[PDB]
Design a protein around this motif. Structure first.
Motif, PDB file in Angstrom:
ATOM      1  N   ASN A  45      53.017  46.888  47.065  1.00  0.00           N
ATOM      2  CA  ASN A  45      51.587  46.712  47.179  1.00  0.00           C
ATOM      3  C   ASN A  45      51.269  45.216  47.345  1.00  0.00           C
ATOM      4  OD1 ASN A  45      50.324  49.632  46.832  1.00  0.00           O
ATOM      5  ND2 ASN A  45      51.715  49.478  45.097  1.00  0.00           N
ATOM      6  N   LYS A  88      38.276  36.888  40.732  1.00  0.00           N
ATOM      7  CA  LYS A  88      39.346  36.597  39.792  1.00  0.00           C
ATOM      8  C   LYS A  88      40.640  36.477  40.569  1.00  0.00           C
ATOM      9  CE  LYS A  88      37.786  39.942  36.587  1.00  0.00           C
ATOM     10  NZ  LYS A  88      38.651  41.024  37.135  1.00  0.00           N
ATOM     11  N   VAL A  89      40.820  37.307  41.567  1.00  0.00           N
ATOM     12  CA  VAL A  89      42.077  37.242  42.309  1.00  0.00           C
ATOM     13  C   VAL A  89      42.250  35.944  43.054  1.00  0.00           C
ATOM     14  CG1 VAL A  89      43.441  38.294  44.133  1.00  0.00           C
ATOM     15  CG2 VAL A  89      42.254  39.694  42.504  1.00  0.00           C
ATOM     16  N   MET A 106      41.939  45.786  51.747  1.00  0.00           N
ATOM     17  CA  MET A 106      43.127  46.429  51.192  1.00  0.00           C
ATOM     18  C   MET A 106      42.835  47.903  50.859  1.00  0.00           C
ATOM     19  SD  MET A 106      45.481  45.587  47.838  1.00  0.00           S
ATOM     20  CE  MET A 106      44.184  46.218  46.763  1.00  0.00           C
ATOM     21  N   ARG A 116      51.562  34.762  32.877  1.00  0.00           N
ATOM     22  CA  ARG A 116      50.775  35.798  32.245  1.00  0.00           C
ATOM     23  C   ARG A 116      50.494  36.955  33.213  1.00  0.00           C
ATOM     24  NH1 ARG A 116      46.202  37.549  32.501  1.00  0.00           N
ATOM     25  NH2 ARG A 116      44.582  36.188  33.337  1.00  0.00           N
ATOM     26  N   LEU A 148      51.428  40.948  33.303  1.00  0.00           N
ATOM     27  CA  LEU A 148      50.413  41.960  33.459  1.00  0.00           C
ATOM     28  C   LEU A 148      50.795  42.917  34.590  1.00  0.00           C
ATOM     29  CD1 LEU A 148      47.539  42.907  32.613  1.00  0.00           C
ATOM     30  CD2 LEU A 148      46.666  41.586  34.524  1.00  0.00           C
ATOM     31  N   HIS A 149      51.208  42.396  35.736  1.00  0.00           N
ATOM     32  CA  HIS A 149      51.333  43.267  36.887  1.00  0.00           C
ATOM     33  C   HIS A 149      52.575  44.125  36.740  1.00  0.00           C
ATOM     34  CE1 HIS A 149      48.061  40.872  38.377  1.00  0.00           C
ATOM     35  NE2 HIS A 149      47.842  41.745  39.312  1.00  0.00           N
ATOM     36  N   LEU A 206      44.653  32.552  42.821  1.00  0.00           N
ATOM     37  CA  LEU A 206      45.406  32.057  43.979  1.00  0.00           C
ATOM     38  C   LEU A 206      45.077  30.578  44.213  1.00  0.00           C
ATOM     39  CD1 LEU A 206      47.307  34.048  45.368  1.00  0.00           C
ATOM     40  CD2 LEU A 206      45.378  34.817  46.652  1.00  0.00           C
ATOM     41  N   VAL A 221      52.802  47.859  38.735  1.00  0.00           N
ATOM     42  CA  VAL A 221      52.404  47.925  40.130  1.00  0.00           C
ATOM     43  C   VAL A 221      53.645  47.989  41.018  1.00  0.00           C
ATOM     44  CG1 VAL A 221      51.311  46.657  42.071  1.00  0.00           C
ATOM     45  CG2 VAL A 221      50.205  46.729  39.845  1.00  0.00           C
ATOM     46  N   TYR A 265      45.377  52.410  41.650  1.00  0.00           N
ATOM     47  CA  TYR A 265      45.400  51.393  40.616  1.00  0.00           C
ATOM     48  C   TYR A 265      44.019  51.076  40.047  1.00  0.00           C
ATOM     49  CZ  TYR A 265      50.306  50.861  41.791  1.00  0.00           C
ATOM     50  OH  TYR A 265      51.667  51.037  41.923  1.00  0.00           O
ATOM     51  N   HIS A 308      38.632  53.183  37.956  1.00  0.00           N
ATOM     52  CA  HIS A 308      37.378  52.987  37.237  1.00  0.00           C
ATOM     53  C   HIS A 308      36.356  52.225  38.077  1.00  0.00           C
ATOM     54  CE1 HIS A 308      40.227  49.790  36.758  1.00  0.00           C
ATOM     55  NE2 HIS A 308      39.292  48.970  36.310  1.00  0.00           N
ATOM     56  N   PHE A 309      36.732  51.890  39.319  1.00  0.00           N
ATOM     57  CA  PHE A 309      35.975  51.016  40.186  1.00  0.00           C
ATOM     58  C   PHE A 309      35.073  51.790  41.136  1.00  0.00           C
ATOM     59  CE2 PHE A 309      38.073  46.686  41.293  1.00  0.00           C
ATOM     60  CZ  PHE A 309      38.260  46.404  39.953  1.00  0.00           C
ATOM     61  N   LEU A 349      51.023  47.029  34.063  1.00  0.00           N
ATOM     62  CA  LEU A 349      50.486  47.902  35.106  1.00  0.00           C
ATOM     63  C   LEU A 349      51.588  48.601  35.909  1.00  0.00           C
ATOM     64  CD1 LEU A 349      47.714  45.410  36.310  1.00  0.00           C
ATOM     65  CD2 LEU A 349      47.400  47.406  34.914  1.00  0.00           C
ATOM     66  N   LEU A 394      55.027  37.503  40.825  1.00  0.00           N
ATOM     67  CA  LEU A 394      54.263  38.569  40.198  1.00  0.00           C
ATOM     68  C   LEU A 394      55.122  39.828  40.090  1.00  0.00           C
ATOM     69  CD1 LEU A 394      50.685  38.228  41.751  1.00  0.00           C
ATOM     70  CD2 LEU A 394      51.422  37.581  39.516  1.00  0.00           C
ATOM     71  N   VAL A 435      54.123  33.711  45.858  1.00  0.00           N
ATOM     72  CA  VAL A 435      53.234  34.219  44.828  1.00  0.00           C
ATOM     73  C   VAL A 435      53.596  35.664  44.464  1.00  0.00           C
ATOM     74  CG1 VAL A 435      50.868  34.910  44.293  1.00  0.00           C
ATOM     75  CG2 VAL A 435      51.285  32.671  45.318  1.00  0.00           C
TER      76      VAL A 435
HETATM   77  C1  HEM Z   1      47.990  37.823  45.071  1.00  0.00           C
HETATM   78  C2  HEM Z   1      48.219  38.941  44.436  1.00  0.00           C
HETATM   79  C3  HEM Z   1      47.505  39.229  43.194  1.00  0.00           C
HETATM   80  C4  HEM Z   1      46.821  38.418  42.369  1.00  0.00           C
HETATM   81  C5  HEM Z   1      46.761  36.917  42.444  1.00  0.00           C
HETATM   82  C6  HEM Z   1      46.240  39.234  41.367  1.00  0.00           C
HETATM   83  C7  HEM Z   1      45.517  38.691  40.327  1.00  0.00           C
HETATM   84  C8  HEM Z   1      44.955  39.457  39.384  1.00  0.00           C
HETATM   85  C9  HEM Z   1      44.107  38.952  38.363  1.00  0.00           C
HETATM   86  C10 HEM Z   1      43.684  37.528  38.204  1.00  0.00           C
HETATM   87  C11 HEM Z   1      43.746  40.029  37.609  1.00  0.00           C
HETATM   88  C12 HEM Z   1      42.824  40.015  36.465  1.00  0.00           C
HETATM   89  C13 HEM Z   1      43.613  39.649  35.280  1.00  0.00           C
HETATM   90  C14 HEM Z   1      42.723  39.417  34.108  1.00  0.00           C
HETATM   91  O1  HEM Z   1      41.499  39.655  34.244  1.00  0.00           O
HETATM   92  O2  HEM Z   1      43.247  39.021  33.012  1.00  0.00           O
HETATM   93  C15 HEM Z   1      44.339  41.193  38.159  1.00  0.00           C
HETATM   94  C16 HEM Z   1      44.168  42.448  37.642  1.00  0.00           C
HETATM   95  C17 HEM Z   1      44.652  43.547  38.290  1.00  0.00           C
HETATM   96  N1  HEM Z   1      45.351  43.607  39.426  1.00  0.00           N
HETATM   97 FE1  HEM Z   1      45.980  42.115  40.401  1.00  0.00          FE
HETATM   98  N2  HEM Z   1      46.504  40.527  41.624  1.00  0.00           N
HETATM   99  C18 HEM Z   1      47.249  40.606  42.722  1.00  0.00           C
HETATM  100  C19 HEM Z   1      47.765  41.700  43.383  1.00  0.00           C
HETATM  101  C20 HEM Z   1      47.458  42.988  42.980  1.00  0.00           C
HETATM  102  C21 HEM Z   1      47.883  44.176  43.665  1.00  0.00           C
HETATM  103  C22 HEM Z   1      48.677  44.170  44.941  1.00  0.00           C
HETATM  104  C23 HEM Z   1      47.498  45.263  42.905  1.00  0.00           C
HETATM  105  C24 HEM Z   1      47.514  46.708  43.224  1.00  0.00           C
HETATM  106  C25 HEM Z   1      47.494  47.146  44.494  1.00  0.00           C
HETATM  107  C26 HEM Z   1      46.807  44.704  41.778  1.00  0.00           C
HETATM  108  C27 HEM Z   1      46.223  45.464  40.800  1.00  0.00           C
HETATM  109  C28 HEM Z   1      45.541  44.911  39.718  1.00  0.00           C
HETATM  110  C29 HEM Z   1      44.871  45.733  38.752  1.00  0.00           C
HETATM  111  C30 HEM Z   1      44.806  47.259  38.686  1.00  0.00           C
HETATM  112  C31 HEM Z   1      44.353  44.873  37.849  1.00  0.00           C
HETATM  113  C32 HEM Z   1      43.550  45.261  36.677  1.00  0.00           C
HETATM  114  C33 HEM Z   1      42.200  45.472  37.289  1.00  0.00           C
HETATM  115  C34 HEM Z   1      41.207  45.766  36.218  1.00  0.00           C
HETATM  116  O3  HEM Z   1      41.563  45.956  35.054  1.00  0.00           O
HETATM  117  O4  HEM Z   1      39.993  45.921  36.497  1.00  0.00           O
HETATM  118  N3  HEM Z   1      46.806  43.309  41.867  1.00  0.00           N
HETATM  119  N4  HEM Z   1      45.070  40.827  39.236  1.00  0.00           N
END
Ligand code: HEM
Ligand code: HEM
Ligand code: HEM
Ligand code: HEM
Lengths: 141, 146, 146, 141
Positions: A97, A61-62, A32, A82, A86-87, A66, A93, A42, A45-46, A91, A136, A132
């Motif tokens: 995306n 975690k992602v 991605m 939850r 968050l998203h 899923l 988002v 987004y 910090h990575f 965030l 979100l 899904v």
């Molecule tokens: C299937 C789609 C997605 C799933 C299942 C998903 C799941 C998650 C999970 C599990 C977290 C961590 C939450 C936690 O630790 O409490 C997270 C954080 C986050 N996600 Fe997603 N996410 C998805 C799509 C995306 C997309 C498309 C973006 C941006 C392009 C995104 C950006 C973020 C960011 C910035 C965080 C916080 C990361 C961090 O703090 O280090 N996510 N997401």
């Protein structure tokens, strides 16, 4: 709107990824970031190097999230409540995306399980990833 | 944007390895299976009730060969993708009435078919190169839409 | 496509009647209310928790005036919309990182604000003319995306 | 995902259109055919003149269906079941076309009720029309 057969299909292709949630998740994220570099805003910090500790931990975690979704495929909204907060709310988002990440998840299953990701299976997995994503992005306010 | 030397190399070296008949048949079949409204644009090819019917339609299999041969002409005109595709853009708009949002859906199916046939060549960097190509080709096919 | 004489007339005659400060403030406020993720791109304007906060943000109201003044420069360059918008396209892509799907969402809000301020001038034919304009302007702002 | 306030908002703006379902529906269709002429391929058999008997009759059926939706805003899927079969399965209407019609419905309320279609109200009505479109495109197979 996922049929019974769609659900059995998703559960079977998902079974392949068991044992591999970190590895497959890390790869879905690296693809991605590389194919759609606008998604990197987004994650300021990575460390974006290949197999960085951070990208592996986030990939896991992602994909773990899923995986829970597959195990609660009859109640996605409650299984993902939850995370929608968050998203969408914290965030903010941009919704486009979620299509990129969904696509990169398909590519990871095609590379590792090409014979298992048949046309009917692809159609099911794609329906699950749209479902899904729609949960979100359901809490923008 | 222009393709750089590393992107061009990934594109040219992979495409040389692709079976365009087989891949093309596969990509067209998958789009009609995954996005079923697209069947309306081809209702002259016959039987398209279900996936079994689509995979056994000789007209779908042959048309898929010609779509991928044409996409693969992008690879010889990396400099000039928009210009090269302008007439096809016009035919899609005027003759086939295809909604241009659909071009990006097929680009993504082609990436999935390439990944599944050439999993060792389709590195993270190669996929990034192909994703740029498929996005340029979908945009060139959308361009004569007026 | 080119604008014909009847389309140009609708566009030019309506725009002469538009209060660009008021309409512009209204359109920007409505997009941040209707599509809340867009608030992320402006998080330097302050308070954008809710609609009341957005309607009372002086920075949102002023920025909306400048966006609609700029869109209204299309009307003086109907021939050359893409060329005229190229730098703004570049600034949106490079400096503000805005996803280009958002440009068509604002085009549709501008059509709703014009309809509500000029309901007798915004006939079926006039709306068709404006819809073509707003689609050309969203495409010109998406064009330098590479 | 429509809040309680969204629902009260939709019910109040919709009340304005009562008495006007044919007229507002006819206009929403004429605007869709004129601003987005690619939608006309779905209606080969229709006289496309202004206020043609056919466009008025179709405008009315469309808006009557949308009126029932407002009256069953807690169960859109069941209130729109048959219509989803029709649009997605029998007509195979390309999904992008539901965004055009939704937009033209907003324009009709802005022209006739500009003060009533405030920013918060617009946000509610737009959420309702997306919810309606998502049901009508939920049965592609
Ligand atoms: C299937 C789609 C997605 C799933 C299942 C998903 C799941 C998650 C999970 C599990 C977290 C961590 C939450 C936690 O630790 O409490 C997270 C954080 C986050 N996600 Fe997603 N996410 C998805 C799509 C995306 C997309 C498309 C973006 C941006 C392009 C995104 C950006 C973020 C960011 C910035 C965080 C916080 C990361 C961090 O703090 O280090 N996510 N997401
Ligand atoms: C990479 C994207 C695409 C390419 C390169 C492509 C290329 C072509 C080519 C080469 C033809 C043959 C035209 C001729 O013989 O004159 C064609 C025909 C056609 N294409 Fe596409 N196409 C693409 C995407 C699509 C999509 C997304 C749709 C619909 C969802 C579509 C629908 C059609 C139709 C309906 C025809 C006419 C079918 C027939 O009678 O053979 N195409 N396209
Ligand atoms: C008709 C469509 C649009 C036009 C004509 C337009 C025009 C402009 C103009 C003229 C500026 C001022 C740039 C400068 O002073 O150098 C600007 C800034 C900006 N635009 Fe847009 N814009 C449009 C759509 C959008 C959309 C859809 C978004 C986001 C969803 C967006 C986000 C921004 C941002 C973040 C800035 C910088 C904000 C600031 O600090 O002032 N624009 N735009
Ligand atoms: C809010 C969105 C929509 C609603 C509520 C709606 C509702 C309806 C209704 C009530 C019917 C008549 C069904 C019957 O008589 O049994 C119908 C038919 C139809 N609709 Fe839709 N529709 C919508 C969107 C669209 C769109 C976007 C298209 C195409 C651009 C479309 C194309 C058609 C066509 C072709 C028919 C059949 C017309 C006929 O046979 O004369 N509809 N729709």
């Amino acid at each position: 709107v996922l049929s019974m057969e769609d659900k059995s299909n998703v559960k079977a292709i998902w079974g392949k990824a068991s044992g591999h949630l970190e590895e497959y998740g890390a790869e879905a994220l690296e693809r991605m970031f590389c194919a759609y570099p606008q998604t990197k805003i987004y994650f300021p910090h990575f460390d974006m190097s290949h197999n960085s500790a951070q990208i592996r931990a986030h990939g896991k975690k992602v994909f773990s999230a899923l995986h829970e979704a597959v195990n609660h495929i009859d109640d996605l909204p409650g299984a993902l409540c939850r995370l929608s907060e968050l998203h969408a709310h914290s965030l903010r988002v941009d919704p486009v995306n979620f299509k990129f990440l969904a696509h990169c998840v398909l590519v990871v299953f095609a590379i590792h399980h090409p014979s298992a990701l048949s046309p009917e299976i692809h159609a099911s997995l794609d329906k699950f990833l749209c479902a899904v994503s729609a949960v979100l992005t359901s809490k923008y306010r | 944007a222009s393709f750089d030397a590393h992107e061009r190399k990934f594109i040219v070296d992979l495409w040389a390895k692709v079976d365009v008949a087989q891949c093309g048949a596969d990509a067209l079949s998958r789009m009609l299976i995954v996005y079923p409204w697209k069947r309306r644009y081809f209702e002259h090819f016959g039987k398209m009730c279900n996936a079994h019917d689509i995979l056994h339609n000789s007209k779908v299999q042959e048309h898929g060969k010609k779509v991928l041969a044409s996409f693969g002409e992008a690879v010889k005109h990396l400099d000039n993708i928009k210009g090269h595709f302008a007439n096809l853009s016009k035919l899609h708009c005027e003759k086939f009435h295809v909604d241009p949002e659909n071009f990006k859906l097929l680009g993504d199916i082609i990436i999935i078919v390439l990944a599944a046939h050439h999993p060792e060549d389709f590195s993270v960097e190669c996929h990034a190169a192909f994703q740029k190509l498929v996005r340029q080709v979908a945009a060139a096919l959308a361009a004569e839409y007026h």
